Short mmCIF file of N, CA and C and ligand atoms in Angstrom, two decimals:
data_model
loop_
_atom_site.label_atom_id
_atom_site.label_comp_id
_atom_site.label_asym_id
_atom_site.label_seq_id
_atom_site.Cartn_x
_atom_site.Cartn_y
_atom_site.Cartn_z
N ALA A 25 117.36 -208.98 46.76
CA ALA A 25 118.37 -209.25 47.51
C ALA A 25 119.35 -208.18 47.34
N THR A 26 119.74 -207.39 48.60
CA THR A 26 120.62 -206.17 48.62
C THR A 26 122.02 -206.55 48.42
N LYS A 27 122.71 -206.12 47.53
CA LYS A 27 123.91 -206.44 47.13
C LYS A 27 124.75 -205.19 47.94
N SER A 28 126.13 -205.69 48.25
CA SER A 28 126.92 -205.08 48.98
C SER A 28 128.47 -205.05 48.64
N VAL A 29 128.99 -203.81 48.63
CA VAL A 29 130.42 -203.88 48.46
C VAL A 29 131.17 -202.87 49.36
N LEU A 30 132.29 -203.16 49.71
CA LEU A 30 133.33 -202.41 50.43
C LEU A 30 134.86 -202.08 49.81
N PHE A 31 134.82 -200.67 49.64
CA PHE A 31 136.14 -200.54 48.72
C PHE A 31 137.18 -200.42 50.02
N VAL A 32 138.42 -200.77 49.81
CA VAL A 32 139.14 -200.48 50.88
C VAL A 32 140.67 -200.07 50.29
N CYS A 33 141.28 -199.27 51.18
CA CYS A 33 142.60 -198.68 50.58
C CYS A 33 143.68 -198.83 51.90
N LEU A 34 144.60 -198.31 52.13
CA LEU A 34 145.59 -198.10 53.19
C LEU A 34 145.12 -197.64 54.42
N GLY A 35 144.74 -196.00 54.29
CA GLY A 35 144.22 -195.41 55.29
C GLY A 35 142.73 -195.24 55.44
N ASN A 36 142.07 -195.50 54.42
CA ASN A 36 140.59 -195.30 54.22
C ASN A 36 140.10 -193.83 54.48
N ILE A 37 141.07 -192.71 53.83
CA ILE A 37 140.91 -191.13 53.71
C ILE A 37 140.79 -190.72 52.45
N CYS A 38 141.36 -191.55 51.54
CA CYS A 38 141.54 -191.17 50.05
C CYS A 38 140.85 -191.96 48.92
N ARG A 39 141.63 -192.87 48.69
CA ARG A 39 141.37 -193.99 47.47
C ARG A 39 139.94 -194.31 47.78
N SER A 40 139.95 -195.34 49.05
CA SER A 40 138.65 -195.97 49.32
C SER A 40 137.35 -194.94 49.59
N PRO A 41 137.33 -193.95 50.35
CA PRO A 41 136.04 -193.13 50.23
C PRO A 41 135.88 -192.36 49.16
N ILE A 42 136.89 -192.32 48.22
CA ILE A 42 136.42 -191.63 46.62
C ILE A 42 135.74 -192.66 45.86
N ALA A 43 136.01 -193.88 45.72
CA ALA A 43 135.91 -194.81 45.22
C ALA A 43 134.15 -195.20 45.76
N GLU A 44 134.05 -195.18 47.27
CA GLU A 44 132.65 -195.43 47.90
C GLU A 44 131.65 -194.35 47.37
N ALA A 45 132.10 -192.82 47.31
CA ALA A 45 131.34 -191.71 46.88
C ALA A 45 131.05 -191.77 45.54
N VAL A 46 131.94 -192.44 44.55
CA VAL A 46 131.62 -192.48 43.38
C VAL A 46 130.50 -193.72 42.80
N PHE A 47 131.02 -194.75 43.68
CA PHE A 47 129.84 -195.81 43.75
C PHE A 47 128.55 -195.37 43.92
N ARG A 48 128.46 -194.89 45.24
CA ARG A 48 127.17 -194.42 45.53
C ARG A 48 126.52 -193.52 44.70
N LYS A 49 126.89 -192.47 44.17
CA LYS A 49 126.40 -191.59 43.14
C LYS A 49 126.00 -192.41 42.02
N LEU A 50 126.92 -193.35 41.24
CA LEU A 50 126.40 -193.90 40.01
C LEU A 50 124.88 -194.85 40.85
N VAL A 51 124.81 -195.68 41.35
CA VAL A 51 124.04 -196.47 41.90
C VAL A 51 122.62 -195.45 42.46
N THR A 52 122.69 -194.13 42.68
CA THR A 52 122.10 -193.24 43.07
C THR A 52 121.46 -192.56 41.81
N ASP A 53 122.31 -192.24 40.80
CA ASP A 53 121.91 -192.07 39.60
C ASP A 53 121.11 -193.04 38.70
N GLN A 54 121.30 -194.23 38.97
CA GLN A 54 120.55 -195.20 38.22
C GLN A 54 119.24 -195.83 38.96
N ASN A 55 118.79 -194.90 39.90
CA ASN A 55 117.73 -195.43 40.62
C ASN A 55 117.48 -196.58 41.82
N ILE A 56 118.94 -196.99 42.00
CA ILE A 56 119.21 -198.18 42.92
C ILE A 56 119.94 -198.19 43.75
N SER A 57 120.08 -196.99 44.39
CA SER A 57 120.74 -197.09 45.80
C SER A 57 120.31 -197.81 47.02
N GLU A 58 118.95 -198.14 47.06
CA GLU A 58 118.28 -199.01 47.53
C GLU A 58 118.64 -200.13 47.70
N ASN A 59 119.32 -200.57 46.74
CA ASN A 59 119.48 -201.99 46.36
C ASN A 59 120.83 -202.38 46.78
N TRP A 60 121.71 -201.25 47.47
CA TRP A 60 123.12 -201.52 47.57
C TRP A 60 123.48 -201.17 48.99
N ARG A 61 124.19 -201.85 49.49
CA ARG A 61 125.05 -201.35 50.81
C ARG A 61 126.54 -201.31 50.37
N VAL A 62 126.91 -199.76 50.45
CA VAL A 62 128.08 -199.50 49.88
C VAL A 62 129.13 -198.84 51.32
N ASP A 63 130.35 -199.05 51.59
CA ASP A 63 131.19 -198.67 52.41
C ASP A 63 132.82 -198.43 52.04
N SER A 64 133.43 -198.16 53.01
CA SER A 64 134.67 -198.45 52.65
C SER A 64 135.50 -198.37 53.99
N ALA A 65 136.80 -198.89 54.15
CA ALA A 65 137.51 -199.54 55.05
C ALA A 65 138.94 -199.41 54.97
N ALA A 66 139.72 -199.56 55.97
CA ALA A 66 141.38 -199.22 55.96
C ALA A 66 141.81 -200.95 56.22
N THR A 67 143.12 -200.82 55.52
CA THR A 67 143.85 -202.13 56.08
C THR A 67 144.53 -201.91 57.40
N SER A 68 144.88 -200.42 57.22
CA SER A 68 145.89 -199.82 58.83
C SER A 68 144.83 -199.08 59.69
N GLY A 69 145.45 -198.91 60.84
CA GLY A 69 145.11 -198.16 61.39
C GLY A 69 145.65 -196.56 61.74
N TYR A 70 146.16 -196.33 60.58
CA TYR A 70 146.93 -195.11 60.67
C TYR A 70 145.71 -193.91 60.74
N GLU A 71 144.54 -193.96 60.37
CA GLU A 71 143.95 -192.63 60.30
C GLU A 71 142.38 -193.02 60.62
N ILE A 72 142.17 -193.99 61.53
CA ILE A 72 141.17 -194.43 62.24
C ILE A 72 140.26 -193.22 62.96
N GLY A 73 138.89 -192.90 62.72
CA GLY A 73 138.24 -191.62 63.05
C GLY A 73 138.54 -190.09 62.39
N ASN A 74 139.20 -190.10 61.12
CA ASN A 74 139.42 -189.25 60.62
C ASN A 74 138.65 -189.14 59.24
N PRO A 75 138.35 -187.83 58.75
CA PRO A 75 137.34 -187.57 57.43
C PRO A 75 138.36 -187.78 56.49
N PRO A 76 137.86 -187.84 55.35
CA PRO A 76 138.86 -187.89 54.01
C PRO A 76 139.62 -186.72 53.79
N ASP A 77 140.91 -187.00 53.30
CA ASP A 77 141.90 -186.20 52.64
C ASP A 77 141.44 -184.95 52.19
N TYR A 78 141.53 -183.64 52.62
CA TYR A 78 140.90 -182.66 52.03
C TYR A 78 141.55 -182.46 50.45
N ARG A 79 142.76 -182.86 50.28
CA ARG A 79 143.46 -183.03 48.56
C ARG A 79 142.46 -183.97 47.93
N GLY A 80 141.81 -184.84 48.59
CA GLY A 80 140.62 -185.65 47.87
C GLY A 80 139.32 -184.91 47.57
N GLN A 81 139.25 -184.34 48.72
CA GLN A 81 137.75 -183.49 48.71
C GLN A 81 137.82 -182.38 47.79
N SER A 82 139.02 -181.81 47.54
CA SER A 82 139.25 -180.76 46.37
C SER A 82 138.74 -181.51 45.02
N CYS A 83 139.26 -182.64 44.81
CA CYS A 83 139.13 -182.98 43.51
C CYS A 83 137.58 -183.41 43.50
N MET A 84 137.12 -183.94 44.28
CA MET A 84 135.52 -184.44 44.40
C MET A 84 134.43 -183.38 44.19
N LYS A 85 135.08 -182.09 44.87
CA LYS A 85 134.58 -180.66 44.84
C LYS A 85 134.38 -180.54 43.29
N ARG A 86 135.41 -180.78 42.75
CA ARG A 86 135.60 -179.93 41.26
C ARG A 86 134.59 -180.92 40.16
N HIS A 87 134.51 -182.19 40.66
CA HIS A 87 133.78 -183.15 40.05
C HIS A 87 132.12 -183.51 40.43
N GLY A 88 131.94 -182.36 41.35
CA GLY A 88 130.47 -182.30 41.79
C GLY A 88 130.02 -183.75 42.75
N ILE A 89 130.84 -184.22 43.25
CA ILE A 89 130.49 -185.72 43.74
C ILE A 89 130.71 -185.43 45.44
N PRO A 90 129.59 -185.31 46.22
CA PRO A 90 129.88 -185.02 47.49
C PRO A 90 130.53 -186.32 48.34
N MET A 91 131.08 -186.17 49.43
CA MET A 91 132.02 -187.01 49.98
C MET A 91 132.05 -186.66 51.47
N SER A 92 131.81 -187.82 52.06
CA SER A 92 131.73 -187.60 53.33
C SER A 92 132.19 -189.30 54.25
N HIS A 93 132.83 -189.25 55.35
CA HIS A 93 133.14 -190.56 55.76
C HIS A 93 133.80 -190.47 56.96
N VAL A 94 134.15 -191.41 57.87
CA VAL A 94 134.78 -191.34 58.94
C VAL A 94 135.67 -192.64 58.98
N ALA A 95 137.03 -192.70 58.58
CA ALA A 95 137.88 -193.77 58.29
C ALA A 95 137.72 -194.88 59.34
N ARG A 96 137.77 -195.97 59.18
CA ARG A 96 137.92 -197.28 60.12
C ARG A 96 138.57 -198.34 59.37
N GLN A 97 138.82 -199.04 60.52
CA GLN A 97 139.70 -200.55 59.60
C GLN A 97 138.80 -201.77 59.74
N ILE A 98 138.92 -202.22 58.35
CA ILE A 98 138.28 -203.63 58.32
C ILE A 98 138.36 -204.40 59.75
N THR A 99 137.55 -205.33 59.49
CA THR A 99 137.08 -205.99 60.75
C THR A 99 136.68 -207.65 60.36
N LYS A 100 136.83 -208.55 61.17
CA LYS A 100 136.50 -209.74 60.93
C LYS A 100 135.17 -210.03 60.23
N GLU A 101 134.17 -209.32 60.85
CA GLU A 101 132.91 -209.22 60.23
C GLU A 101 132.56 -208.98 59.09
N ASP A 102 133.73 -207.99 58.39
CA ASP A 102 133.46 -207.90 57.05
C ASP A 102 133.49 -208.64 55.88
N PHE A 103 134.13 -209.27 56.40
CA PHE A 103 134.46 -210.37 55.54
C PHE A 103 133.34 -211.38 55.42
N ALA A 104 132.36 -211.39 56.16
CA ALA A 104 131.14 -212.25 56.45
C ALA A 104 129.62 -211.59 55.56
N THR A 105 129.95 -210.25 56.01
CA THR A 105 128.67 -209.70 55.36
C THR A 105 128.72 -209.09 53.77
N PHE A 106 130.00 -208.51 53.53
CA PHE A 106 130.22 -207.95 52.07
C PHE A 106 130.26 -209.15 51.15
N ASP A 107 129.59 -208.64 49.87
CA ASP A 107 129.62 -209.73 48.75
C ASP A 107 131.13 -209.40 47.95
N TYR A 108 131.37 -208.05 47.90
CA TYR A 108 132.64 -207.91 47.45
C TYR A 108 133.45 -206.98 48.13
N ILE A 109 134.61 -207.02 48.31
CA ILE A 109 135.95 -206.17 48.95
C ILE A 109 136.67 -205.96 47.50
N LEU A 110 136.69 -204.65 47.03
CA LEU A 110 137.47 -203.95 45.93
C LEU A 110 138.61 -203.19 46.72
N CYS A 111 139.65 -203.43 46.38
CA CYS A 111 141.02 -202.84 47.08
C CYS A 111 141.72 -202.03 45.72
N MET A 112 142.70 -201.39 46.20
CA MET A 112 143.50 -200.50 45.59
C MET A 112 144.82 -200.91 44.94
N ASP A 113 145.77 -201.62 45.72
CA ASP A 113 146.82 -202.45 45.40
C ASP A 113 147.10 -203.49 45.57
N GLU A 114 148.39 -204.17 45.40
CA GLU A 114 148.78 -205.43 45.59
C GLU A 114 149.11 -205.65 47.05
N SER A 115 149.39 -204.45 47.88
CA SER A 115 149.75 -204.66 49.26
C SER A 115 148.40 -204.66 49.64
N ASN A 116 147.50 -203.97 49.38
CA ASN A 116 146.02 -204.06 50.04
C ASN A 116 145.80 -205.61 50.13
N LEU A 117 145.82 -206.17 48.88
CA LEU A 117 145.23 -207.55 48.50
C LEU A 117 146.15 -208.35 49.23
N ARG A 118 147.00 -208.27 49.16
CA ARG A 118 147.93 -209.05 50.30
C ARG A 118 147.28 -209.30 51.80
N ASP A 119 147.19 -208.10 52.42
CA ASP A 119 146.80 -208.10 53.69
C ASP A 119 145.32 -208.41 53.74
N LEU A 120 144.34 -208.14 52.72
CA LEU A 120 142.90 -208.67 52.96
C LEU A 120 142.96 -210.13 52.53
N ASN A 121 143.89 -210.91 51.78
CA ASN A 121 143.75 -212.15 51.64
C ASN A 121 144.48 -212.66 53.16
N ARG A 122 145.25 -212.37 53.67
CA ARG A 122 145.86 -213.02 55.06
C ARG A 122 144.92 -212.65 55.93
N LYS A 123 144.04 -211.72 56.17
CA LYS A 123 143.12 -211.31 57.19
C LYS A 123 141.97 -212.46 56.79
N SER A 124 141.55 -212.53 55.53
CA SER A 124 140.42 -213.32 55.30
C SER A 124 140.76 -214.83 55.72
N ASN A 125 141.85 -215.24 55.79
CA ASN A 125 142.18 -216.80 56.17
C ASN A 125 142.05 -216.84 57.62
N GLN A 126 141.93 -215.80 58.29
CA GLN A 126 141.82 -215.64 60.13
C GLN A 126 140.45 -216.10 60.32
N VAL A 127 139.27 -215.99 59.36
CA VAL A 127 138.13 -215.82 59.74
C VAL A 127 137.25 -217.44 59.18
N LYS A 128 136.19 -217.73 59.85
CA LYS A 128 135.50 -218.97 59.28
C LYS A 128 134.78 -218.81 58.07
N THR A 129 134.03 -217.36 58.20
CA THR A 129 133.14 -217.02 56.97
C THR A 129 133.68 -215.95 56.06
N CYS A 130 134.15 -216.33 55.19
CA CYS A 130 134.31 -215.30 54.26
C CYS A 130 133.72 -215.42 52.75
N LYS A 131 132.42 -214.68 52.58
CA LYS A 131 131.50 -214.57 51.90
C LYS A 131 132.13 -213.74 50.85
N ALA A 132 132.84 -212.86 51.01
CA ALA A 132 133.63 -211.63 50.07
C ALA A 132 134.43 -212.24 48.97
N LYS A 133 133.75 -211.89 47.66
CA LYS A 133 134.99 -212.17 46.81
C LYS A 133 136.11 -210.77 47.06
N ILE A 134 137.27 -211.26 47.05
CA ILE A 134 138.33 -209.77 47.40
C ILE A 134 139.03 -209.82 45.87
N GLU A 135 139.06 -208.56 45.63
CA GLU A 135 139.56 -208.19 44.22
C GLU A 135 140.20 -206.83 44.21
N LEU A 136 141.32 -206.58 43.23
CA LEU A 136 141.64 -205.25 43.02
C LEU A 136 140.44 -204.40 42.11
N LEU A 137 139.91 -203.06 42.52
CA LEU A 137 139.01 -202.57 41.84
C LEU A 137 139.67 -202.30 40.51
N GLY A 138 141.01 -202.17 40.18
CA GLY A 138 141.45 -202.13 38.87
C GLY A 138 141.09 -203.00 37.98
N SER A 139 140.94 -204.13 38.53
CA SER A 139 140.85 -205.42 37.61
C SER A 139 139.27 -205.06 36.85
N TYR A 140 138.88 -204.10 37.23
CA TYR A 140 137.33 -203.78 36.48
C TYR A 140 137.65 -202.48 35.36
N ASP A 141 138.81 -202.22 35.30
CA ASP A 141 139.57 -201.05 34.37
C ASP A 141 139.31 -201.50 32.97
N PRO A 142 138.30 -200.78 32.20
CA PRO A 142 138.59 -201.31 30.57
C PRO A 142 139.84 -200.78 30.22
N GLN A 143 140.48 -199.72 30.72
CA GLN A 143 141.77 -199.29 30.20
C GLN A 143 143.04 -199.91 30.64
N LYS A 144 142.74 -201.02 31.64
CA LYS A 144 143.54 -201.76 32.09
C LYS A 144 144.82 -201.40 33.31
N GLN A 145 144.51 -200.15 33.54
CA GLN A 145 145.32 -199.48 34.60
C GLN A 145 144.98 -200.07 36.09
N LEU A 146 145.63 -201.50 36.19
CA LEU A 146 145.46 -202.23 37.37
C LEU A 146 145.52 -201.60 38.90
N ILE A 147 146.42 -200.65 38.96
CA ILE A 147 146.80 -200.59 40.33
C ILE A 147 146.40 -198.77 40.30
N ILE A 148 145.52 -198.57 41.46
CA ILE A 148 145.20 -197.57 41.84
C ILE A 148 146.33 -196.87 43.01
N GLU A 149 146.98 -196.17 42.47
CA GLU A 149 148.28 -195.84 43.35
C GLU A 149 147.94 -194.96 44.51
N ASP A 150 148.61 -195.07 45.71
CA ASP A 150 148.61 -194.29 46.82
C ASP A 150 149.11 -192.65 46.33
N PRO A 151 148.25 -191.82 46.44
CA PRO A 151 148.69 -190.38 46.02
C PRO A 151 149.22 -189.54 47.09
N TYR A 152 149.24 -190.16 48.25
CA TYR A 152 149.66 -189.04 49.38
C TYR A 152 150.90 -188.35 49.33
N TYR A 153 152.00 -188.91 48.45
CA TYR A 153 153.21 -188.14 48.40
C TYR A 153 153.00 -187.56 46.79
N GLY A 154 151.85 -187.41 46.20
CA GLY A 154 151.84 -186.93 45.14
C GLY A 154 151.35 -185.73 44.86
N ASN A 155 150.98 -185.41 43.56
CA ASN A 155 150.19 -184.01 43.27
C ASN A 155 148.94 -184.42 43.25
N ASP A 156 148.38 -182.74 42.67
CA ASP A 156 147.12 -182.73 42.08
C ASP A 156 146.72 -183.90 41.00
N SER A 157 147.41 -183.80 39.89
CA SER A 157 147.22 -184.61 39.07
C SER A 157 146.77 -186.04 39.37
N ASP A 158 147.76 -186.67 40.51
CA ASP A 158 147.71 -187.94 41.06
C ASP A 158 146.39 -188.27 41.70
N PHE A 159 145.81 -187.29 42.32
CA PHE A 159 144.01 -187.62 42.97
C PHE A 159 143.39 -187.42 41.59
N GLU A 160 143.37 -186.39 40.62
CA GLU A 160 142.70 -186.72 39.50
C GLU A 160 142.83 -188.05 38.80
N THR A 161 143.88 -188.66 39.06
CA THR A 161 143.94 -189.75 37.84
C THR A 161 143.30 -191.22 38.98
N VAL A 162 143.16 -191.06 40.28
CA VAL A 162 142.78 -191.91 40.97
C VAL A 162 141.45 -191.82 40.94
N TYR A 163 140.86 -190.64 40.83
CA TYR A 163 139.37 -190.24 40.64
C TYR A 163 138.84 -190.80 39.56
N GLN A 164 139.66 -190.59 38.41
CA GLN A 164 139.14 -191.00 36.96
C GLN A 164 139.39 -192.78 37.04
N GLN A 165 140.25 -193.54 37.65
CA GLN A 165 140.13 -194.70 37.94
C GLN A 165 139.08 -195.20 38.26
N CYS A 166 138.47 -194.59 39.77
CA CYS A 166 137.51 -195.38 40.35
C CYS A 166 136.26 -194.59 39.34
N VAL A 167 136.13 -193.70 38.69
CA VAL A 167 134.63 -193.71 37.87
C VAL A 167 134.80 -195.07 36.90
N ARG A 168 135.95 -194.95 36.17
CA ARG A 168 136.00 -196.28 34.98
C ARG A 168 135.87 -197.50 35.74
N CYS A 169 136.42 -197.81 36.96
CA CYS A 169 135.93 -199.02 37.65
C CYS A 169 134.82 -199.56 38.15
N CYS A 170 134.41 -198.50 38.97
CA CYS A 170 132.94 -198.64 39.30
C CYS A 170 132.01 -198.51 38.52
N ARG A 171 131.94 -197.89 37.31
CA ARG A 171 130.92 -198.02 36.21
C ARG A 171 131.35 -199.61 35.61
N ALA A 172 132.51 -199.98 35.47
CA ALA A 172 132.39 -201.71 34.88
C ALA A 172 132.04 -202.60 36.01
N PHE A 173 132.26 -202.16 37.14
CA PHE A 173 131.78 -202.99 38.17
C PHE A 173 130.65 -203.32 38.46
N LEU A 174 129.73 -202.11 38.33
CA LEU A 174 128.24 -202.15 38.58
C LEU A 174 127.71 -202.99 37.19
N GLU A 175 128.12 -202.49 36.19
CA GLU A 175 127.57 -203.38 35.00
C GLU A 175 127.75 -204.56 34.89
N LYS A 176 128.93 -205.27 35.27
CA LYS A 176 128.82 -206.81 35.61
C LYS A 176 130.18 -207.32 36.59
N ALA A 177 129.66 -207.82 37.62
CA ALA A 177 130.59 -208.23 38.60
C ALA A 177 131.38 -209.23 38.22
N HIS A 178 132.57 -209.32 38.67
CA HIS A 178 133.34 -210.53 38.34
C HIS A 178 132.88 -211.93 39.25
O1 LIG B 211 146.21 -193.03 53.70
C1 LIG B 211 147.01 -193.12 52.89
N1 LIG B 211 148.33 -193.06 52.49
C2 LIG B 211 149.38 -193.37 54.11
C3 LIG B 211 150.72 -192.71 53.88
C4 LIG B 211 151.44 -192.60 54.60
C5 LIG B 211 151.02 -193.09 55.98
C6 LIG B 211 149.95 -193.64 56.35
C7 LIG B 211 148.93 -193.55 55.18
C8 LIG B 211 146.17 -192.92 51.61
C9 LIG B 211 146.13 -191.21 51.23
C10 LIG B 211 146.58 -190.62 50.07
C11 LIG B 211 146.21 -189.07 49.92
C12 LIG B 211 146.15 -188.46 50.96
C13 LIG B 211 145.55 -189.07 52.32
C14 LIG B 211 145.70 -190.71 52.60
S1 LIG B 211 144.70 -193.76 51.30
O2 LIG B 211 145.09 -195.41 51.35
O3 LIG B 211 144.36 -193.67 49.81
O4 LIG B 211 143.82 -193.48 52.14
#
């Protein structure tokens, strides 16, 4: 039975495509990518059609994890098809819950990705107005959370 996860952030050009790429690498490394549908989407329409922010690409290149995506906004269908929708911050979470209540079928469990962090850094903060170190922190959070999520979903 194929499992599925959608990572979600505000623009879908940084936090969620990083989480998506980190997770895809993890399952590929453990020989189970074929068992997973992995994707990412945005709560907003700010960046639809755009590639991941290059500041995030720079970070990912340093860690040797390839990343490619075209930003898209989450849709009503996503709530029906995904097992998990894992988002970055409380604002994302409130929007996703609002949207989920507008559809008939919500298969997805909607949660903060950070709820999986063994180090308990609950929020994955938007690094848009931040510096290199903020992108690195996002990356590290995604690694820790994705590993924990794969090991045992809530
Ligand atoms: O879209 C974003 N923020 C945002 C900030 C201001 C206006 C619109 C979007 C976020 C982002 C962070 C770093 C570099 C690019 C984008 S994301 O949610 O992580 O993708």
